[PDB]
Design a protein around this ligand. Structure first.
Ligand SMILES: Cc1cn([C@H]2C[C@H](O)[C@@H](COP(=O)(O)OP(=O)(O)OP(=O)(O)O)O2)c(=O)[nH]c1=O
Ligand SMILES: Cc1cn([C@H]2C[C@H](O)[C@@H](COP(=O)(O)OP(=O)(O)OP(=O)(O)O)O2)c(=O)[nH]c1=O
Ligand SMILES: Cc1cn([C@H]2C[C@H](O)[C@@H](COP(=O)(O)OP(=O)(O)OP(=O)(O)O)O2)c(=O)[nH]c1=O
Ligand SMILES: [Mg+2]
Ligand SMILES: [Mg+2]
Ligand SMILES: [Zn+2]
Ligand SMILES: [Zn+2]
Ligand SMILES: [Zn+2]
Ligand SMILES: [Zn+2]
Lengths: 173, 170, 157, 169
């Protein structure tokens, strides 16, 4: 039946990649998927003859009942949706395969959005690791911010963030 | 090479088992381990070879003992209010910290500081039990069979059951 | 819902431990298990034919040290096809890294394969995926433990 | 820090996808990768450090791999010199990663893959979804055309991923 799967880890780990792997897997079995991304203007990646949908939204309420038609819900950048838990649950309880790719922690390692709160509801949690972009010789589980902004929500990539190991995360300069 | 590893899931999944598997693994490599378990009890530092097991209510009660050890294994981590800071301070010192815990309580709310610890972990494995209601599906939640509201209620099979999703609401 | 699950890795990785974890898991759900070594039953046997039809009564078959059983594949398959949860803990490779028994040959039939890692008992600071033999015996089958084998990483091997 | 990592499972499981996820990981850390694919009727190379070859036997890469941090070999099952090659490289300190079918359409060991397992520091088996019953994971590959040959290159028009029950139906 229905469930919630969570894909977490730092930036540069391939979480989104893994989310889509699972999506393509379901499509080959002719199961209908609805991919939900967050309103964050940044370049992405049609190739099947199945039922496949793709929304970009600020709050999951904005999808209304659209999801009911679908077998599989894939939510990327889940950390930015404030109604994540209730939404995934309501859907999973309806018998939907809900999959969520997210940062578990922000640049200061504080719980990012409702992600840590979602964990108790998940039938599976996979944490991916990046490679450390400072020492290049250890896996990376944290994300360090290279610009001087305090705000938690700051959309961006390699020019503003680096994936790091433990030692490296505290290295000052 | 220091780090935090987290082992979670519902009751009856073998988390503690897995914690100890990893402990024995380290011992075979002559690496020293300090196993920290939870309620109202002892300390030991014998079998102290050149060639430990504590039970406590708060991790402060271990003082600096851990500094001598290669590997820290903390079972039932959910009950320790100073978990995050403790595992971090240790991991940063270069210690292999491993934690077995319930990620969620009987109402599926975050249990203790476990969910808060996740961002600090280099690894997170969630184990699954078998559903003890329908016996034909894996189990990821813990249901409470007695009528107590309190979150902290220590106990086993007579007070809790591991369940799948459908069963959890039945 | 029948299947084969394989638990492999070198010595000192806790394979047997992991096999039993899964067993206890099933018992708590009141599912009947039959543990085969080389509600709960436990046999010790040289060839799996020696169990006859006993397994038919059971929900879950756990086979430890599977590498030593020459009839492993056909047995696990026949059972899994009957709807049994068959679980196998084994060394995938011997001390010279050659395929041990019918284990590598079983992989294509498995719904799951987990390889566990030990800690390297030479350098103490890297995971271990191979088993080195410390005594000078050539024979592949040599039963024993820490006095005759060590788990190692690549460099150390 | 050298090693061999194996990614196996049936068709339609995303093995190749997973191989490339790991590759992009390494690249972000400015680590040089050399992706080696299979091809029978044609051989090919391209460099500028990320490289991509297509070849019939891994000997055809000569010493090119020595310059690289990370070797990714897709469809490893078709290379008869796989074990010795991955080992030689891993022993040199290379991160060797291999995506492959562990078994063929009749579930017999495909190429040298099962023989490579004892040499691997990691083995992940991916699962597809069953394309017959659509409601169970899939760990085997069934062939839908009538060819006996083991080597038959192709996709969804010639193969389906299945669960256990379905594989015999
Ligand atoms: C589910 C739950 C457990 N508890 C208590 C009761 C148990 O003694 C303890 C859970 O510890 P566990 O170690 O999870 O118990 P277990 O042996 O069943 O699990 P495993 O085999 O995986 O180790 O916490 C609560 O206080 N509140 C709760 O909601
Ligand atoms: C390495 C090796 C072992 N053996 C035998 C000796 C052992 O008794 C047996 C391996 O048993 P294991 O149970 O693998 O050894 P272990 O108990 O140390 O590891 P774990 O707890 O992780 O299961 O196989 C061989 O015959 N040839 C070999 O090359
Ligand atoms: C099953 C099977 C495949 N093949 C060939 C056909 C395919 O081209 C190739 C399978 O490799 P894959 O890369 O595994 O096919 P895929 O891309 O569908 O799967 P994934 O997404 O997991 O990478 O091997 C055979 O020659 N014989 C066989 O029995
Ligand atoms: Mg326990
Ligand atoms: Mg492919
Ligand atoms: Zn680093
Ligand atoms: Zn159930
Ligand atoms: Zn070593
Ligand atoms: Zn099927």
């Amino acid at each position: 039946r229905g469930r919630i799967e969570l894909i977490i880890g730092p930036m540069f780990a391939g979480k989104t990649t893994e989310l889509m792997r699972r999506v393509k897997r379901e499509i080959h079995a002719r199961r209908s998927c609805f991919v939900i991304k967050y309103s964050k203007d940044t370049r992405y990646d049609h190739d099947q003859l199945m039922l496949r949908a793709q929304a970009a939204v600020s709050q999951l309420t904005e999808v209304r009942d659209t999801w009911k038609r679908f077998d599989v819900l894939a939510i990327d950048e889940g950390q930015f949706f404030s109604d994540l838990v209730d939404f995934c649950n309501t859907a999973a309880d309806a018998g939907k395969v809900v999959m969520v790719s997210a940062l578990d922690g922000d640049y200061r390692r504080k719980p990012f959005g409702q992600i840590c709160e979602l964990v108790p509801y998940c039938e599976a949690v996979d944490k991916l690791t990046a490679v450390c972009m400072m020492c290049h010789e250890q896996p990376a589980c944290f994300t360090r911010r290279t610009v001087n902004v305090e705000q938690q929500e700051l959309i961006g990539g390699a020019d503003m963030y680096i994936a790091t190991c433990r030692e490296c995360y505290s290295k000052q300069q």
